[PDB]
Amino acid sequence: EIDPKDLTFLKELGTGQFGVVKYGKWRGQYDVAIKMIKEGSMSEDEFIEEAKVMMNLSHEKLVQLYGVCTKQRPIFIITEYMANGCLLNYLREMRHRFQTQQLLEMCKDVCEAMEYLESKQFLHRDLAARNCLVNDQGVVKVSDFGLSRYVLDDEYTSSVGSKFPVRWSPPEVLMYSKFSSKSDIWAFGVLMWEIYSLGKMPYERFTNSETAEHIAQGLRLYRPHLASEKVYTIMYSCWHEKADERPTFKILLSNILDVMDEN
Numbered sequence: 521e522i523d524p525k526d527l528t529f530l531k532e533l534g535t536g537q538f539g540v541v542k543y544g545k546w547r548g549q550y551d552v553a554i555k556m557i558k559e560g561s562m563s564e565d566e567f568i569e570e571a572k573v574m575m576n577l578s579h580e581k582l583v584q585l586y587g588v589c590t591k592q593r594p595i596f597i598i599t600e601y602m603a604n605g606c607l608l609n610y611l612r613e614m615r616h617r618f619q620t621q622q623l624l625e626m627c628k629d630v631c632e633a634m635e636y637l638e639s640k641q642f643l644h645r646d647l648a649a650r651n652c653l654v655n656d657q658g659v660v661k662v663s664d665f666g667l668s669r670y671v672l673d674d675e676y677t678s679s680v681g682s683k684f685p686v687r688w689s690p691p692e693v694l695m696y697s698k699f700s701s702k703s704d705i706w707a708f709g710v711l712m713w714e715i716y717s718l719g720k721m722p723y724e725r726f727t728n729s730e731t732a733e734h735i736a737q738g739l740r741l742y743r744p745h746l747a748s749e750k751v752y753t754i755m756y757s758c759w760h761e762k763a764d765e766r767p768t769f770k771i772l773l774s775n776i777l778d779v780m781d782e783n
């Protein structure tokens with residue numbers, strides 16, 4: 521429980537699934553982001569009841585959830601600040617600057633975070649470049665892990681809703697709402713594709729339902745120009761139809777490190 525008196529609001533960062541997010545400082549020194557949770561946007565009682573595990577998740581490649589302010593309305597979620605914003609926009613804006621080594625390093629950053637989450641049996645549930653953030657030194661970190669569970673918005677929570685991350689979902693999520701470590705694995709593959717395509721929309725020009733239909737029948741994302749065959753093999757392994765044939769994040773990290781060593 522953070523004392524809201526210790527927070528200084530400094531800048532509007534935009535709006536996300538829970539409403540307004542602001543940049544500020546904690547105790548005049550530490551850079552933070554502060555989600556001000558819009559009333560009715562979140563299952564607050566449920567989040568508060570369950571939130572301690574999420575705060576104890578600690579890793580260099582996670583965007584840390586520092587604490588909460590719950591003795592007030594609206595409630596706040598205080599996290600680590602990331603000066604370069606979300607990875608999807610960062611890729612798009614610096615598109616002509618990246619070397620292939622840096623793209624691989626981004627994949628490694630995310631994979632390390634996810635390997636940690638996997639070891640804690642904690643699901644992200646909405647992994648995608650938009651839910652990775654970038655610090656002032658270009659380090660990529662995974663953000664808002666586990667929060668999708670508390671979203672109150674039928675357009676997001678229903679698999680036929682317009683905000684559901686269909687393009688990041690395996691068949692068993694689309695058909696059965698069966699989330700597991702292996703649905704995060706699928707999403708990580710799509711994320712690697714977002715990285716190597718330098719921020720393109722997966723299945724662009726397909727609607728969500730067309731995407732569902734086509735992946736169910738075995739359609740997969742093509743190899744981006746900048747991805748080597750070894751890199752494509754890694755992302756492709758995430759997309760096995762059967763969840764039990766997909767690798768673990770431990771295995772993916774080993775795969776990524778091996779490519780780095782060869783390069």
Ligand SMILES: Cc1c(NC(=O)c2cc3c(s2)CCCC3)cccc1-c1cn(C)c(=O)c(Nc2ccc([C@@H]3C(=O)N(C)CCN3C)cc2)n1
Nearest residue numbers: 533534535536537538541553600601602603605664667668
């Ligand atoms: C995480 C986030 C959101 N998204 C969310 O809060 C949620 C996503 C999900 C939720 S809530 C529940 C379900 C799962 C998905 C919205 C706006 C800012 C930030 C955000 C957070 N953090 C932790 C940051 O460090 C950060 N940094 C940042 C943002 C914007 C800019 C900068 C800017 O100031 N503006 C105004 C736009 C251009 N941009 C580059 C720079 C850094 N943004």
